[PDB]
Amino acid sequence: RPTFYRQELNKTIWEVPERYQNLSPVGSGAYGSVCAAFDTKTGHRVAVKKLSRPFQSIIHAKRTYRELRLLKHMKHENVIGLLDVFTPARSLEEFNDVYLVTHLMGADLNNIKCQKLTDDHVQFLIYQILRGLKYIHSADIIHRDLKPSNLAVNEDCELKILDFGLARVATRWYRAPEIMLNWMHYNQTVDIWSVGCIMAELLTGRTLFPGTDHIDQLKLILRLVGTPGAELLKKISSESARNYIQSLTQMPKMNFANVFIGANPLAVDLLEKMLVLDSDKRITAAQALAHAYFAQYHDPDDEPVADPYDQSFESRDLLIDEWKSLTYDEVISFVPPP
Ligand SMILES: C[C@H](Nc1nccc(-c2c(-c3ccc(F)cc3)c(=O)n(C3CCNCC3)n2C)n1)c1ccccc1
């Protein structure tokens, strides 16, 4: 084991190994906190995340295990992955803190180039999100909360997806209507909806469906895509949902060409295929990557899929000490990248 050093940051103590220097708080909240650090053993700059109260409850302990398993699994350029994972703990018995390490990214999509993002910037960014989603979706993982603050980018416009599979600017703004209005049954194209919303925003400078609550939000969405016809209305189980929607007079579906007016017509068509209510008819990430709007970036030989990922743990009901020991084991078996 390495040599650690302790230190208190933003009223947050940190006990990390010597290899990481110049810790400097970058972000925080409920989840825990993140510091930018310099990693002396490889010359690279990293982000160190200390989980907040990793084993305070069964739900905490399970989410901790969930995050570590997710992160150890993802190996892709457009998906945050694991450089290192460590604990001060010298034994299972002492184990109470988890720190996760990944390459440092510059900012998130809220605050990063132009005011007018430019259509080629748009192309590259959305291309990278779709390529990351492709990988993720291929492991039967779904983001569920995809949005600009979960998309990290570099000054070079390199992009990585953050916080995927954890939700087991405003979130509601980018959420697919089917999971928004509670649906246990949807598919991975919920994340494509969000992509749609993000893409629109970039191109346009304004949030596509702002919305002050779930009702205002759904109203804003039907205005653009139009009320569900009888074809889609057949797949809505709840009288509840079906009565409200059938309760509002039909809204026609708008001409996207006129909403996003003078955007690249290729952009608009793609927007048209992503922002469909029927989640059965919504384009998937692998299909979107083959749309013409990305002819300049698309490369079928370099848009890999994930190895199979075992989330059998997810239906497991265990005690905190079982989740905690599961997590400790994953720390101990961690193999850094080559
Ligand atoms: C400067 C900082 N750089 C950075 N780099 C890489 C990963 C990160 C990073 C991580 C993170 C850090 C280390 C890991 F091993 C895994 C993930 C993380 O969990 N977040 C937030 C995601 C939203 N939920 C709260 C935590 N961020 C921003 N941060 C940053 C701060 C804010 C936005 C984007 C980037």
288 Cβ closer than 6 Å to some ligand 1 atom? no
Please tell me the distance between residue 241's alpha carbon and the centre of ligand 1 in angstroms: 37
Task: Mark whether 163 is an active-site residue.
Answer: yes
User: How many C-beta atoms lie closer than 10 Å to residue 80's C-beta?
Assistant: 22
Residues in the annotated binding site: 26-34, 49
Question: Nominal resolution in Å?
Answer: 2.0
- In sequence order, what are the residues at sequence separation of 6 or more whose Cβ sits closer than 8 angstroms to the Cβ of residue 196? 208, 271, 274, 275
All structural domains of the chain, each given as residue ranges with its CATH number in brackets, are 1-106+306-335 (3.30.200.20), 107-305 (1.10.510.10)
Distance CA 51, CA 267 (A): 39
Method: X-ray
Distance CA 101, CA 49 (A): 6
16 Cβ closer than 6 Å to some ligand 1 atom? no
Q: Which of 145, 163, 299, 329 is catalytic?
A: 163
Sheet of 107-108: strand order equals 107-108, 151-153, 159-161
Distance CA 252, CA 83 (A): 50
Q: Are strands 99-103 and 20-28 parallel, antiparallel or unpaired?
A: unpaired
What's the one-letter identity of residue 41? Answer: K
Q: Which DSSP symbol is given to 60?
A: H
Sheet of 20-28: strand order equals 20-28, 32-39, 44-51, 99-103, 84-86
47 Cβ closer than 6 Å to some ligand 1 atom? yes
332, β-bridge pairs: none
